[PDB]
Write a structure and sequence with these properties.
homodimer; Nucleotidyltransferase, domain 5; binds the ligand CCCCCCCNC(=O)CCNC(=O)[C@H](O)C(C)(C)COP(=O)(O)O; binds adenosine-5'-diphosphate; ATP binding (chain B); alpha/beta; 23% strand; 2 domains; 267 residues
Chain lengths: 267, 266
């Protein structure tokens, strides 16, 4: 009975491994007390921890547990998941889009943190609440899917008008930039929520394509729970990566890269 | 009288020049018709245009005018201003933070667009209105200055708690990340406004420090009107640039590097 736990700022990713049988459990960081209660209830052969609140679990647990650096764990697990899903990538940039975004570069041997930004899921949830007053994650993300950004976001062509723009006119010039041109029109909580996800997506992708260029790689692997139930963010990210001449990748159970990695670093 | 005009998405920057003494005019893009009216009533030896709405002016004007690419003009006017103010920088990343942000690299000869982002002044104004129903620029920018982001932004140390973080704990982990931990506390339009400027600043600086590393340079020059009346954004940007081992620079009349550039170009 082997168990790996990535206790982040928002979600706790549990990976149970029994006689070559993987289980993917996901409880909130908000309800960490219930995760410790559960863990205490059973004998685990080897326990491996990673992420922010990994110490919290370690303190309140009455069982020994090894602790690993999330940056190294995420990379390990991603390697495992990519080759399992038939991806043989020599090099790549991997974006861990969690509460906040952590940018890494993998050179076929090891990872290196090459950047990070505070535009992740925590912003989708945070700014999402201030613009819709919705606290439920599913509800917020689902609401956002068919929202219109035309009245909210400003495009390059809107500034350049008839004039030939020096970069693609369809591109977003200014996020929320159109808001003051549409003071008459009602800003729907859907339209507004779409625009939050749009800016978060565009920032993560811009940062990701920049370091992909820097470390001379065309492969970008996107991981983290921010992608769960948010198909709009996935398309926002995916479409821009392609437009920036890069190859986007989404791994199944990629938000468990951390947790999986913890199990395969001890041995 | 030689005149340069950078007609952007939000502001029109006019720099008129008459015998080594300059004039720095600002008129809104909203009131472009008034700018054309004035120019038609002005005795201009040489007219140079740049930016988004440069064509609009050129069409409605009854005087010929040379049109230049803003990416090249900005670079030109910036170097004139840089040198004049005693900055002799070999190489430098320059961020033109206007309605939207554009990122360039200057190799002691010419510039190259190396990035861009939709997180500029247009976002401060746009998201600023949705979070405060304030349309007045000055008002929006002055309210933000005395705003607290503790209840709004999430820091690395908040996630890592007592555990030693793998990057500085004081750093912003997630913008608006704290909002759901403070649902009890009611979010002041000033606290909210500082968070908008904070994220805009942090995105521009992160992107700027990344390309500064990429094109092997430590100098970062920040320009655009987004810095006007917004001391908070300036400090947000300035402090992070330094923390990332880079040299930040703010040039006097930097938001005119486009209208200056246009004059001294061909
Ligand atoms: N059930 C959920 N509850 C809360 N946030 C969720 C949920 N599913 C996905 N998310 C998203 O995932 C983000 C956290 O990402 P995650 O990869 O788990 O990061 P961390 O490891 O820092 O907790 C949240 O900010 C939110 O966008
Ligand atoms: N009086 C003002 N009214 C509106 N915006 C202003 C004003 N002064 C400065 N700004 C700021 O400058 C930004 C535009 O910057 P600017 O350098 O003119 O770029 P652009 O060329 O895209 O117009 C605005 O979005 C706003 O944040
Ligand atoms: C002045 C404040 C500067 C903040 C600029 C943004 C830099 N921030 C980051 O690189 C942190 C981004 N997020 C993360 O690394 C993850 O959420 C992590 C804490 C590792 C989990
Ligand atoms: C969804 C995919 C498209 C959006 C990706 C964001 C990239 N956008 C940009 O680089 C435009 C940034 N803005 C600018 O350079 C200026 O404000 C300008 C258009 C020159 C005026």
């Amino acid at each position: 009975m082997k168990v790996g736990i990535d206790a982040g700022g928002t979600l706790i990713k549990i990976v149970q491994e029994q006689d070559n049988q993987r289980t993917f459990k996901t409880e909130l960081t908000k309800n960490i007390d219930q995760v410790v209660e559960w863990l205490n209830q059973q004998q685990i052969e080897k326990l491996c921890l990673t992420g922010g609140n990994a110490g919290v679990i370690a303190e309140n647990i009455n069982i020994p547990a090894q602790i690993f650096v999330e940056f190294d764990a995420a990379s390990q697990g991603l390697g495992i998941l990519l080759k399992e899903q038939g991806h043989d990538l020599a090099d790549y940039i991997f974006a861990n889009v969690g509460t906040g975004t952590s940018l890494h570069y993998f050179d076929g041997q090891s990872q290196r943190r090459v950047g990070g930004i505070g535009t992740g899921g925590g912003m989708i949830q945070g700014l999402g609440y201030l613009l819709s007053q919705i606290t439920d994650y599913k509800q917020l993300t689902d609401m956002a899917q068919h929202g219109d950004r035309n009245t909210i976001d400003l495009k390059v062509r809107h500034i350049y008008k008839d004039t030939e723009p020096p970069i693609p006119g369809d591109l977003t010039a200014a996020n929320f930039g159109h808001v003051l041109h549409h003071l008459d029109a009602d800003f729907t909580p859907s339209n507004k929520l779409a625009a939050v996800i749009g800016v978060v997506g565009e920032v993560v992708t811009t940062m990701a394509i920049t370091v992909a260029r820097e470390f001379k790689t065309e492969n970008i692997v996107y991981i983290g729970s921010s992608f769960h139930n948010n198909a709009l963010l996935r398309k926002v990210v995916e479409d821009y990566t392609v437009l920036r001449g890069c190859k986007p990748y989404y791994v199944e159970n990629g938000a468990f890269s951390g947790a999986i990695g913890a199990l395969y670093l001890e041995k």
